[PDB]
């Protein structure tokens, strides 16, 4: 019954084509509830979930003001980072930020995160104790020391254990008709002859939420991960996800294989076998 609230921020410089593109999205578990696109016409944090529309004008003006400030901060960051890495102003660069909190089944603080990346790699990240930082390279050291001096960790810890938790709790309550659901996957298996002596067994998982899930194939109870073609979990587009796992087996040996499905919405893991 674990839950989380997470914000994802992306800023991409476009040299010779204006300010950096800034995109921010907010999530509760696997459900997006807000968004901001520096390139959109509204220029305001927009709702993306029914239950968040409940928030009044103060909320939206507040979130808008803060998301825009995040935008400005990353714009500055991009230029600062080029200097740190002694890079020219000619290429495009990306700054990404991700932070949030997780609460347990009791909805009490479990853990907090706040990570930062440059051009797709770890730059700096708050340690799990929410008191110290992990900086990859030499260049990230400056940021680490600046943030330590300004008590950024303390500020973040207060937010992650407090503000983030209370609002996450509020959201779960306001969206109690959808946000708290754990939809187990609908499953089934297909069988297709590849030749006269081999057949494909595909194990399907559809309409599930949250996206987290485990689909494995076993032969005589042995894990067959290396022989499996497992696609990445995909969003159906309606708030549910999908996934499948396939294995090619010798015709006539199907009975020895079992597909196992693990998911938060399932009261018991499933064990399927072709019949």
């Amino acid at each position: 019954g674990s839950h989380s609230m997470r914000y994802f921020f992306t800023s991409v410089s476009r040299p010779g084509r204006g300010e950096p593109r800034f995109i921010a999205v907010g999530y509760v578990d696997d459900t997006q509830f807000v968004r901001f696109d520096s390139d959109a016409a509204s220029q305001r944090m927009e709702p993306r979930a029914p239950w968040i529309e409940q928030e009044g004008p103060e909320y939206w003006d507040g979130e808008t003001r803060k998301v825009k400030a995040h935008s400005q901060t990353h714009r500055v960051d991009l230029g600062t980072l080029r200097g740190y890495y002694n890079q020219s102003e000619a290429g495009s660069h990306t700054v990404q930020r991700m932070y949030g909190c997780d609460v347990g089944s009791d909805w009490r603080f479990l853990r907090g995160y706040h990570q930062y990346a440059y051009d797709g790699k770890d730059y700096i990240a708050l340690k799990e104790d929410l008191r110290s930082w992990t900086a990859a390279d030499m260049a990230a050291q400056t940021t680490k020391h600046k943030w330590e001096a300004a008590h950024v960790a303390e500020q973040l810890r207060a937010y992650l254990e407090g503000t983030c938790v209370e609002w996450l709790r509020r959201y779960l309550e306001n969206g109690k008709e959808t946000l708290q659901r754990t939809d187990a996957p609908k499953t089934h298996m297909t069988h297709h002859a590849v030749s006269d002596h081999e057949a494909t067994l595909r194990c399907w998982a559809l309409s599930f939420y949250p996206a987290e899930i485990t689909l494995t194939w076993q032969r005589d109870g042995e894990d067959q991960t290396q022989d499996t073609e497992l696609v990445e979990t995909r969003p159906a587009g309606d708030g549910t996800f999908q996934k499948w796992a396939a294995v090619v087996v010798p015709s006539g040996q199907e009975q020895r294989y079992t597909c196992h499905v693990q998911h938060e919405g399932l009261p018991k893991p499933l064990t399927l076998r072709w019949e």
């Binding site: 907010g26 803060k66 400030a69 901060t73 500055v76 700096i124 503000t163 983030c164």
Partner: peptide, 9 residues
């Protein structure tokens, strides 16, 4: 609900 304070890199 976004984190308010700004922290420059």
């Amino acid at each position: 609900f976004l984190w308010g304070p700004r922290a420059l890199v």
